[PDB]
Amino acid sequence: LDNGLLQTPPMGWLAWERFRCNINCDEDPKNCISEQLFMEMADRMAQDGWRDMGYTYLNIDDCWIGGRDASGRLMPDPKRFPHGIPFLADYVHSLGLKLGIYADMGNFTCMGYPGTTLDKVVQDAQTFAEWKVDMLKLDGCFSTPEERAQGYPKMAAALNATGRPIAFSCSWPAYEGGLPPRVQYSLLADICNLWRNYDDIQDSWWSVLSILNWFVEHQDILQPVAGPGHWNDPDMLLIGNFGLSLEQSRAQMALWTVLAAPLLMSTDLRTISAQNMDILQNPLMIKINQDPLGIQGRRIHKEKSLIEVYMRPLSNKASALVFFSCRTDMPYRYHSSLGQLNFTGSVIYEAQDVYSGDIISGLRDETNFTVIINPSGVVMWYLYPIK
Amino acid sequence: LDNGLLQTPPMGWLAWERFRCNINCDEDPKNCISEQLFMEMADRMAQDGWRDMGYTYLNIDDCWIGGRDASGRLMPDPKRFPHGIPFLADYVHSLGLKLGIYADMGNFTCMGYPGTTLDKVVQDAQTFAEWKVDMLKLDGCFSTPEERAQGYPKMAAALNATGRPIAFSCSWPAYEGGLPPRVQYSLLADICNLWRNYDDIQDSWWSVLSILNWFVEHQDILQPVAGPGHWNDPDMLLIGNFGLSLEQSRAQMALWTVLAAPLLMSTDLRTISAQNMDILQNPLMIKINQDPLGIQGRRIHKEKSLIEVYMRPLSNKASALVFFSCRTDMPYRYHSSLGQLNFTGSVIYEAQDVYSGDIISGLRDETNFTVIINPSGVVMWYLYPIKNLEMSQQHHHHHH
Ligand SMILES: *[C@@H]1O[C@H](CO)[C@@H](O[C@@H]2O[C@H](CO)[C@@H](O[C@@H]3O[C@H](CO[C@H]4O[C@H](CO)[C@@H](O)[C@H](O)[C@@H]4O)[C@@H](O)[C@H](O[C@H]4O[C@H](CO)[C@@H](O)[C@H](O)[C@@H]4O)[C@@H]3O)[C@H](O)[C@H]2NC(C)=O)[C@H](O)[C@H]1NC(C)=O
Numbered sequence: 001l002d003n004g005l006l007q008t009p010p011m012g013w014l015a016w017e018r019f020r021c022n023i024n025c026d027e028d029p030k031n032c033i034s035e036q037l038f039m040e041m042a043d044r045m046a047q048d049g050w051r052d053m054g055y056t057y058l059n060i061d062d063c064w065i066g067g068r069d070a071s072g073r074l075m076p077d078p079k080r081f082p083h084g085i086p087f088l089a090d091y092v093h094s095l096g097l098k099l100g101i102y103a104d105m106g107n108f109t110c111m112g113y114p115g116t117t118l119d120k121v122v123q124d125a126q127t128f129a130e131w132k133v134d135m136l137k138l139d140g141c142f143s144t145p146e147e148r149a150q151g152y153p154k155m156a157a158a159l160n161a162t163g164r165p166i167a168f169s170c171s172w173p174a175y176e177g178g179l180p181p182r183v184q185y186s187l188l189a190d191i192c193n194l195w196r197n198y199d200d201i202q203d204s205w206w207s208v209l210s211i212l213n214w215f216v217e218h219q220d221i222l223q224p225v226a227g228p229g230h231w232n233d234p235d236m237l238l239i240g241n242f243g244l245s246l247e248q249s250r251a252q253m254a255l256w257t258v259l260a261a262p263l264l265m266s267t268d269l270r271t272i273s274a275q276n277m278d279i280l281q282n283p284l285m286i287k288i289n290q291d292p293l294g295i296q297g298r299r300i301h302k303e304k305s306l307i308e309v310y311m312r313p314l315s316n317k318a319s320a321l322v323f324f325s326c327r328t329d330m331p332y333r334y335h336s337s338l339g340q341l342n343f344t345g346s347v348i349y350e351a352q353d354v355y356s357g358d359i360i361s362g363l364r365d366e367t368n369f370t371v372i373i374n375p376s377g378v379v380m381w382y383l384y385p386i387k
Numbered sequence: 388l389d390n391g392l393l394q395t396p397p398m399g400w401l402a403w404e405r406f407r408c409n410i411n412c413d414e415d416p417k418n419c420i421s422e423q424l425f426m427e428m429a430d431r432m433a434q435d436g437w438r439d440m441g442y443t444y445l446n447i448d449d450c451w452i453g454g455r456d457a458s459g460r461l462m463p464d465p466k467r468f469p470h471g472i473p474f475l476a477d478y479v480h481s482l483g484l485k486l487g488i489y490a491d492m493g494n495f496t497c498m499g500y501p502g503t504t505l506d507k508v509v510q511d512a513q514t515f516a517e518w519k520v521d522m523l524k525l526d527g528c529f530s531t532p533e534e535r536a537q538g539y540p541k542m543a544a545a546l547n548a549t550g551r552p553i554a555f556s557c558s559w560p561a562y563e564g565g566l567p568p569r570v571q572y573s574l575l576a577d578i579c580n581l582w583r584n585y586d587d588i589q590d591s592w593w594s595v596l597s598i599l600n601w602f603v604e605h606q607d608i609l610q611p612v613a614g615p616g617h618w619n620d621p622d623m624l625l626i627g628n629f630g631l632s633l634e635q636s637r638a639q640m641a642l643w644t645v646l647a648a649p650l651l652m653s654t655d656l657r658t659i660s661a662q663n664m665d666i667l668q669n670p671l672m673i674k675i676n677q678d679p680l681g682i683q684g685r686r687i688h689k690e691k692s693l694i695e696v697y698m699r700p701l702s703n704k705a706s707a708l709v710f711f712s713c714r715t716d717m718p719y720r721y722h723s724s725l726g727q728l729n730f731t732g733s734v735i736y737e738a739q740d741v742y743s744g745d746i747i748s749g750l751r752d753e754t755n756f757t758v759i760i761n762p763s764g765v766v767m768w769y770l771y772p773i774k775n776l777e778m779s780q781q782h783h784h785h786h787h
Pocket residue numbers: 002003004159160161162163164165166
């Protein structure tokens with residue numbers, strides 16, 4: 001979407017995966033969807049390095065809505081958002097952050113809150129702009145395909161007409177199977193800054209693998225459509241939650257990075273472990289994710305050993321490689337060379353291991369190397385030519 | 388098997404899951420299958436609390452064999468076991484541990500090492516006893532169903548005839564589909580101390596779930612067969628390795644305990660984290676696993692919320708309860724009561740949370756309670772009539 005926004009993938013925090021539709025503030029005040037939750041997360045992002053590392057969006061998901069007023073104007077739940085959304089936008093802005101919100105193209109939100117029907121699209125866009133929102137995720141429950149086909153373009157146009165830059169995240173393709181012929185990716189790129197292609201992530205390794213598999217199965221279609229201002233979105237990071245092991249957490253970060261995915265966390269920033277912070281705040285990893293060329297990577301090799309190799313092209317003749325073990329036994333010594341991974345001949349390279357920080361220098365295409373990859377884990381290199 | 392052994396489930400360490408068939412000692416001396424590996428693991432078991440908490444077996448799996456000598460006697464790989472197996476058994480015994488070994492009822496071991504064919508069953512049994520081995524796992528690759536039907540009883544008879552008590556772990560049912568009519572559990576209970584019912588565990592939560600699902604699906608058949616001296620074996624613990632999260636690691640420990648499973652670790656004890664050691668060395672957890680009645684537990688409740696409840700009967704009218712969340716979203720507040728979990732009579736109970744150590748007092752059947760269960764995780768209670776506390780302090784003694 002040609003609105004000047006998200007020339008690199010969005011980084012931030014999104015409520016949904018970890019906090020879901022918990023509205024029981026009487027019994028669970030610390031974890032319910034509420035103004036307090038968002039203010040506390042904003043504070044952590046400001047104070048604990050997140051904003052400084054690039055994590056700038058703080059996004060509200062489903063279950064914020066209270067109703068519509070006599071003029072049809074959307075309102076937040078007054079018990080859980082007592083000061084209203086402008087208050088929260090202003091608070092987040094005072095901390096150098098951006099506020100995202102959520103609506104549904106359809107009669108109701110997925111969890112049954114008031115929907116943004118076709119006849120409400122313009123009003124709702126105007127309300128969000130008036131509130132000084134910075135991003136909108138438009139879900140697609142409780143609509144027909146024809147309604148979504150009218151609605152998503154209508155919302156892009158309505159947001160534009162407000163004059164406020166609002167990043168636009170579109171769930172449209174996920175409701176239509178994610179693929180041609182029903183999904184038109186050139187159309188999506190013209191109307192959306194990012195789109196959810198596929199199924200919601202859940203807090204499990206199986207879920208991560210299911211998403212990775214669908215993305216890699218369809219990478220010939222998906223890889224070319226991503227670029228500055230228009231990203232594929234394989235969903236939220238699980239890092240900091242319950243379902244991923246340490247190796248798996250590091251793997252998701254590396255693989256989302258090579259896929260030029262949004263880095264939208266969804267975890268309790270108030271209690272996040274040092275180990276998990278270190279993954280998410282890895283400076284080179286973020287540099288790679290945020291590479292200005294915005295070229296989504298691909299799986300380039302799959303071996304009978306169950307080692308997979310992904311490659312992302314980067315600025316300044318650099319590349320990212322992710323060596324990914326789908327083995328479930330023990331560490332594996334993977335033997336390769338840059339020549340076996342299709343690199344340019346006669347060039348000499350240097351590599352930095354993104355997780356260890358160690359430097360491997362003087363690699364020619366013919367140079368044999370070994371990387372040790374743990375099960376359901378990765379080794380990631382940032383590689384560039386040297387003199 | 389009525390050989391006086393494994394009146395409670397075996398606890399120990401088995402090389403296979405973590406170290407597999409790594410024989411490259413030239414490139415990987417610290418992690419290859421070798422006498423050094425076993426000696427270092429024994430030292431850790433003796434020094435770091437494992438033995439003292441009940442982990443007594445240290446078991447060799449596949450890939451130890453060098454060949455057979457001119458008389459047909461098994462030899463370990465001389466480059467990897469330069470001192471021989473008797474030396475290793477002696478070393479392990481000197482630390483108060485027991486040594487397990489591995490063979491295959493078939494032409495070769497699964498990784499292609501010399502097989503214990505029917506003609507070698509007796510000789511190999513005699514060799515193992517002479518080496519002062521304490522446990523034998525008998526795998527089933529490269530055999531026919533008739534060879535297994537002959538061989539597993541033949542090995543049980545051969546071990547018996549050596550006069551040395553050797554705990555006998557039989558893979559037979561895993562090669563027959565794990566179920567009647569092909570598997571005859573009444574025979575297995577008479578010839579084996581434990582048996583691998585089902586597929587090999589791998590270092591993933593999906594694997595743990597697949598095994599749990601199978602045991603729960605078939606628990607009407609499987610639960611009654613387990614007891615002192617004859618256990619079901621759902622395979623090794625994954626705690627300490629790569630695939631399980633913290634919540635999953637605690638779940639596996641709890642569920643294996645409720646199932647009266649062996650607690651056979653397979654992890655690098657030299658680098659295991661304090662957090663994972665704390666799960667595996669939990670004294671109440673181990674007490675429950677080792678309960679002298681040896682009654683395997685069952686899943687007693689499954690709810691549309693994806694919370695499941697398992698219960699294991701214990702000594703002195705105590706019970707273990709595991710509340711298990713198969714949810715994949717966020718912590719869940721599970722509301723229940725003992726009455727809803729088929730506790731009847733007007734007994735007043737107390738519970739200890741096995742992981743937190745917290746005590747919950749004054750539970751009657753009607754008492755509403757809430758437990759907070761994390762996704763792919765558990766809450767586990769040791770539950771007892773409160774009158775047990777008093778009665779346990781009011782026993783009276785006299786000299787004989
Ligand atoms: C509502 O919708 C409109 C229409 O889509 C948006 O207006 C567009 O905004 C974008 C982003 O600001 C503009 O794109 C930029 O144009 C710059 C100059 O282009 C001039 O020349 C072209 C022809 O060559 C004319 O069409 C145009 O009128 C301009 O006069 C470029 O310099 C920018 O380049 C950027 O990208 C390149 C590579 O991608 C980088 O090398 C640069 O560094 C730089 O980052 C960019 O292309 C676009 O021109 C606008 N179109 C129109 C018709 O006005 C509104 O932004 C939007 N409003 C809201 C609130 O959402």
